[PDB]
Design a protein around this ligand. Sequence first.
Ligand SMILES: Nc1nc2c(ncn2[C@@H]2O[C@H](COP(=O)(O)OP(=O)(O)O)[C@@H](O)[C@H]2O)c(=O)[nH]1
Ligand SMILES: [Mg+2]
Length: 170
Amino acid sequence: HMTEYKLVVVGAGGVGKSALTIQLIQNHFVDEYDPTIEDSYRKQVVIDGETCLLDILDTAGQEEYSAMRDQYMRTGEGFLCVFAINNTKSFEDIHHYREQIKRVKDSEDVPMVLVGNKSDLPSRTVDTKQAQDLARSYGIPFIETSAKTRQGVDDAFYTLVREIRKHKEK
Ligand SMILES: Nc1nc2c(ncn2[C@@H]2O[C@H](COP(=O)(O)OP(=O)(O)O)[C@@H](O)[C@H]2O)c(=O)[nH]1
Ligand SMILES: [Mg+2]
């Protein structure tokens, strides 16, 4: 009656991991969300005729990974690797998040989507072609999002579900 899909949202502080997740669940842009709140959220949604229950960890910070975060990294089926298109450092940081996932999974073939968030903002410092070059090298999709306008948000999450299905029987 429902298929569970366990998703993890990672990336530098301030890129919009929480805003993206909240925009997915609540259809609202939250302007100011606690940067330290790490928690799991659930969403029921029909994707390609399948009733899915998304179990989504929105990660926050470093320093003594909770039991929960360690659990989700280990048992997570797919990862959204988020940077902001007006945050060059966040883009450069993606390498470290991908290295972490590769280590936790002992594999280069983990379901993953590269997300360039804050597409609504005029201060773009990361070109779509840069992002495309990075995702091409990793062998993953790249999608641009705005948690403010909702552009691409469903698309990122649905695409990650689809990547998981490409990798394993669900
Ligand atoms: N304009 C714009 N602001 C955003 C977007 N996503 C997040 N923000 C803002 O960016 C800041 C960081 O967002 P947050 O979701 O807390 O980042 P996190 O640390 O990655 O969870 C907040 O002030 C949000 O209001 C976006 O798509 N567009
Ligand atoms: Mg957050």
